[PDB]
Amino acid sequence: NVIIGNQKLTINDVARVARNGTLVSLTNNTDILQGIQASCDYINNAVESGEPIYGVTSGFGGMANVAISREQASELQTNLVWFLKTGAGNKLPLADVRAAMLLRANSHMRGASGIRLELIKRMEIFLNAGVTPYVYEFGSIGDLVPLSYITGSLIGLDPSFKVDFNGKEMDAPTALRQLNLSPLTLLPKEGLAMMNGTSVMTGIAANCVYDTQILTAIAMGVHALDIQALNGTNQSFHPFIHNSKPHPGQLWAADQMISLLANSQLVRDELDGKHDYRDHELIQDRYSLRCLPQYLGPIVDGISQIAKQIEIEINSVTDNPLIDVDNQASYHGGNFLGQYVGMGMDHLRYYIGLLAKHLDVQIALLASPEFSNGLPPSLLGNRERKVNMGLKGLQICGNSIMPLLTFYGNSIADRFPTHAEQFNQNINSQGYTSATLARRSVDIFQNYVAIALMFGVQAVDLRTYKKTGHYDARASLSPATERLYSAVRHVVGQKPTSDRPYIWNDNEQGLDEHIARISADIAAGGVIVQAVQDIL
Amino acid sequence: NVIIGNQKLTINDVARVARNGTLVSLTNNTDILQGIQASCDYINNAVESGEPIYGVTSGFGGMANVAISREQASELQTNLVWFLKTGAGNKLPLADVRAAMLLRANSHMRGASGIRLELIKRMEIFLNAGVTPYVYEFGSIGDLVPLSYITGSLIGLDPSFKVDFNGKEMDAPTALRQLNLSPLTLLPKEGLAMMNGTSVMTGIAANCVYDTQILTAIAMGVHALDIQALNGTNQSFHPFIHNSKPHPGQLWAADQMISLLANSQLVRDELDGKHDYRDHELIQDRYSLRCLPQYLGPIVDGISQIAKQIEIEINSVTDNPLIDVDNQASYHGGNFLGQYVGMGMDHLRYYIGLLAKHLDVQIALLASPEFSNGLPPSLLGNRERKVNMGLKGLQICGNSIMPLLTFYGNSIADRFPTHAEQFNQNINSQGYTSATLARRSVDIFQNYVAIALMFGVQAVDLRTYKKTGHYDARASLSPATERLYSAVRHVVGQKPTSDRPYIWNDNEQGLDEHIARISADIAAGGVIVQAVQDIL
Amino acid sequence: NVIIGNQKLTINDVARVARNGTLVSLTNNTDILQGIQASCDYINNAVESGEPIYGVTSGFGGMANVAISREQASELQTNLVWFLKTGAGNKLPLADVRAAMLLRANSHMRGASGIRLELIKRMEIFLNAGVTPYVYEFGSIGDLVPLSYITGSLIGLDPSFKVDFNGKEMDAPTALRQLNLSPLTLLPKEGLAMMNGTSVMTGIAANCVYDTQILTAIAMGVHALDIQALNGTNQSFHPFIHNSKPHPGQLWAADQMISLLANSQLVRDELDGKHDYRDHELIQDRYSLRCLPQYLGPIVDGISQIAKQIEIEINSVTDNPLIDVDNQASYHGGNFLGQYVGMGMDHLRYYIGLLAKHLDVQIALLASPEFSNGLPPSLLGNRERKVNMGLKGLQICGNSIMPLLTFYGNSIADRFPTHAEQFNQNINSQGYTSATLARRSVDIFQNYVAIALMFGVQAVDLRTYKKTGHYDARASLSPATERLYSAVRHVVGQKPTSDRPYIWNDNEQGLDEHIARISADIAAGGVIVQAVQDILPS
């Protein structure tokens, strides 16, 4: 179903395999397989001759002044796995490891790494059988150490390497007995070819960008719900304003907001350019409404830029040395340095914090009667019961998540240690931890967006009540935001009705289970995600 | 065993109860109990009279313009728990919750919160029976929301509140049936008194400072091992140098290094002031050795300052309004704002990153033959086996942890949202997330220090070999570092011997299990901690 | 020379006007002047008809619920200049004030602002006569207050508005007297159209990008000289490696290094795949050299991204309300939010810090005989004089500037105040202080790079001495870095000679003067900058 070797992988391809279990297959294309065999031939012949190659007939890192004889060329590679067995911290999520292996297979198919096809198939097999090596969150300065757990597991080096076999923990040798596979012995270069790359960090980063794209589209849907709850105007998104300031991101954002807001009963419909006075209100919407597309443009634009860079990283040969069989040569290079990943993730986190903080400003308007254009304080539901404080707690919780996202928007690629590994790795990317930090930012932004969805949904109901005498917002919303509003209400198990808004009395729900249910629907690609799929 | 109500709690007291299960008891002192009853009396009488008190006969937050009648005064408090049920993220570790409850009990014993003794005893009971409410990592801007899970669990409000009962998950009502306790109904103020404070964040922060103090002492022991492995001099720590620059922290650090290094065979012993030329080496030790006490002083000093502030926070009445029975009055105040916690944790993280980074510089010297004063590259063990790269992987992993600690040393208290809860909480501490971030920094610094311990231990062995012809460093070290070296070797299960250093061949251990075993010994207060207990 | 209103302005166009005093003209395009006229007539009409329009018949920001009538519509615009006269701190460099007026004139030509041509012409005249209003570094959250000093000066509103007139401080009414210009009265909307855009911050930013593109080219030239000095190999830059990791930036970095190093005698020329054991030393160059194209890729690429976004912001209409004469409507909108400028500048400072850190690591290699591959300690010249310590103080100084560049690499866009201006401006960009902050980054970087260049020139002299027994690197360097080498030696006034390297004895020069002289030459677009002309249009 996903074919490896032929065409370039997309972030979506990566995500299908990682999360959804999408089957994988190596191309059968004989030029591709010839390439793989040719570099293999080449490395074999070079070691036969005792020729100097980095990490083949040489030590590793700042010990690349230790020459290694033809007779210790295999063992060299097997020892590489051992001394790199020094991971720590929590485990990566299994989907990031699936992603890693898919990328490594992709790297190898290019025929410049000198690795046996049989070692590449081992990953196809693990992918299809649902065997996932354990990889730790610490050990890479950007992925030798994380990739040695992948390799040692693939070759069944030792019972000390653990794996997940469809939800069961077991040792790698045992997993290979179950798969009817024999243990493998690394040939010269093959350890290095297994371990000397950016597959893991890029793997984590591929899934981050996937989830961030989605959350951006959900966030867009949230603002659209906010603008309606607020009786804001659609004029701000008028194509004339944005064509005269034509950043791609701003042009896209304003135009998507037009689609989102179209045919809404709750919005001030003023694409004609009407804007009479209002009281007690200001003649214009506040900045969070009015400058939405100018604010969001660079964010939208940056997430695209990063998506574009990750896609090249995913389809790169990322490894050292690179075999050039056409010239019967090998080169010592630096493609293992994941600078696009380390910096793109620093960027991704920074943008997520900027999205969260804008959304939180929309909530502050909603909750505050000074700024909500006539909604009850904290969007309380039942005003006959004076003890209700409505969403006061839900706001505070959102006020606690958002600062943290901006904190995580701090960077890490500039914090690299110049003394790293014997002073040999005097520049490095910090790409691996940057990528795991990015995963942290996305996991937390998912809970954040869930809270923002809750505010939006409750708010339109309470605006509907001001408009119609009832709480069933579905006919008053634009058809596009009605899909999302009704996806959210489906997930949380509260059906829209005319006599009740989403939240009536405080003692009637735990708001925590709604956050949890919504975050889990977003994470799983559920009905909330599908409701905004046209934006993606 | 730990008595609550009498004398001020220490960070050590907090830690014993949280981690070690130390029993707890309310004082029987009748002046203390009179105080508790008096404020209770006072609040009861005030509500009888319909008198305006914040969060008693009033709404909460920016809805404190909603007056609340005497007849809805109880329900008001019960609803406070419900609308604050909006936590998200991972759970706090159980020891931080034990700490919270201990602090809340401590707060309440001061007789200014107007809460029933019976509600204070409920916490004594939960503490002693090993019942630990679930609290989420998100919801507080600094602790209403986290404390509502504590309260609802203590009073068995609903099956939706979960708890840990000695390692088993169950619902709070069920836990109270098992403890033969009846559900409670909150009286006016009591919800607020349960929830309106800094007990959780301070709870988390108490245990962070405890663990950081320990890790500082271990880190000191590490440097002492490094200075020996390097054949550095003891002259740098000479009391004359430091008395003339007499910062407390620097005076303490240099003087402790004297004790640590005393009677070592591996150190250049030069307190007499001898310093002849050396070759090929520089006449002086590099800065990481020589400026150790000047560098560490402000760190040591800051950790003390923070310890001092947390101890006041732990023994504070932290709550609003405060009942003054002596004047038969109540005051609206701000003691719920955890500014010392939010800022002290920002500081604590920043220092941890500075400790990690200095230690990592000591490792770079150890691993690099240009700077190690004659040790093998990467501290390899068996040089007859050319494939050994020794600790190359262990270094890279340390190079990946340290940048992250400095990243976490970024601050959060300055990132507070001024729009928080209806614009009412226009300043806030971010103390709760700061504190959980601090816990992150300590959990990671524990794995970091484990790696540094491994470098030190291996290094002295390899220096011993240069000195004596064997690998048993125990008689060549100072008696103080021999305790720590032998604690580490005990934990990892490798016994010192004359024919073998800690690490001989790479394929002979997984370095990951050693990191894990050491971090877990440090976390549990094991033999590594005890080995440096004289420093604390 | 630079015609405003016709075609899109580039960052080169802006820099030439701001820095080089290039002359400027408004286009005579009749469709362009008709549009300007039409929006002018639209506002005239709407206002006399009593139409409600923001900041024209209201009420600014949080007080946009003040109805103001046509009888007060003129005095509203004039009072807008007064209450905005609240700048603080140091003054903008005059070049960024010139850029700021260039872009504001450019914005107005597009026809959606309803401003008198005569006021757009007034900016042309100031630019060409070399009259520059004083503008302060604080007052904008991203440019009402800064642009109010431009406006106030242009119309000669009051003697307290100050200008530079070709080097002499002067009040603004005095400068209009010298120009034989009459003071102007702002009609309805004109004051807002004058002050409600992104011209200043985008002005500051455009000059930043220009200076960074240049410092990137020089940086590359510095790496090429370090590579030569350390007898590194050209093999890292082989197209086969980078074609298999085809990031645009990394391809470009690799390919420019192949060009910079072409026909050097100080490299190990191994594009054939040759890689013998060194003795007793590492078979590969360290990461600073070997992962150079991979490390520089995102930076090159990011600077290009920013440059593209700034070129769009330069050419955008930034005010509010916007007049659409085709449908006879004005729209209330948000183009005045310079979000691209705030986050872009954030990114730019970040990238500069990253360039600096890589350069400083290369200096570490050169100064240290453990890693220099046989060069003398601290790149010392006269070894016979034992008291010499060569470039030891010069490295310390570089070590004190590089961490400060990475510090400035922190962001400010994410630190916006949500309670800004009566809670009306609940999102904002911080773009003005962000670009202000980028100017400080760029200025410091010009000093850092001078230090970097000095380490490179000295080191190739000493390597050439290693190779040939003399100190003239000119013959041994690749043509492309010879140009740069000679341009630096020219600027500091110490000639290449076979007998002597750049730095012989410590007491023969103040290194501080050499830093100052190279820094000034880069800032001025002098011979050091011309030496890397080739790298620039790519």
UniProtKB/Swiss-Prot annotation, chain C:
Residues of the active site: Y54
Keywords in alphabetical order: Cytoplasm, Lyase, Phenylalanine catabolism, Phenylpropanoid metabolism
Subcellular locations according to the entry: Cytoplasm
Enzyme class of the recorded protein, top EC level: lyase
GO cellular component: a single term: cytoplasm
CDD domains: PAL-HAL
GO function terms (MF aspect): phenylalanine ammonia-lyase activity
Sequence positions that bind (E)-cinnamate: N196, Q284, R290, N320, K392, E421, N424
Pathway(s): Phenylpropanoid metabolism; trans-cinnamate biosynthesis; trans-cinnamate from L-phenylalanine: step 1/1
PROSITE patterns: PAL_HISTIDASE
Effect of L84A: Slightly decreases catalytic rate
SS bond partners: none
Function: Catalyzes the non-oxidative deamination of L-phenylalanine to form trans-cinnamic acid, the first step in the phenylpropanoid pathway.
Subunit structure: Homotetramer.
Family classification: Belongs to the PAL/histidase family.
UniProt-recorded name of the protein: Phenylalanine ammonia-lyase
Organism: Trichormus variabilis (strain ATCC 29413 / PCC 7937)
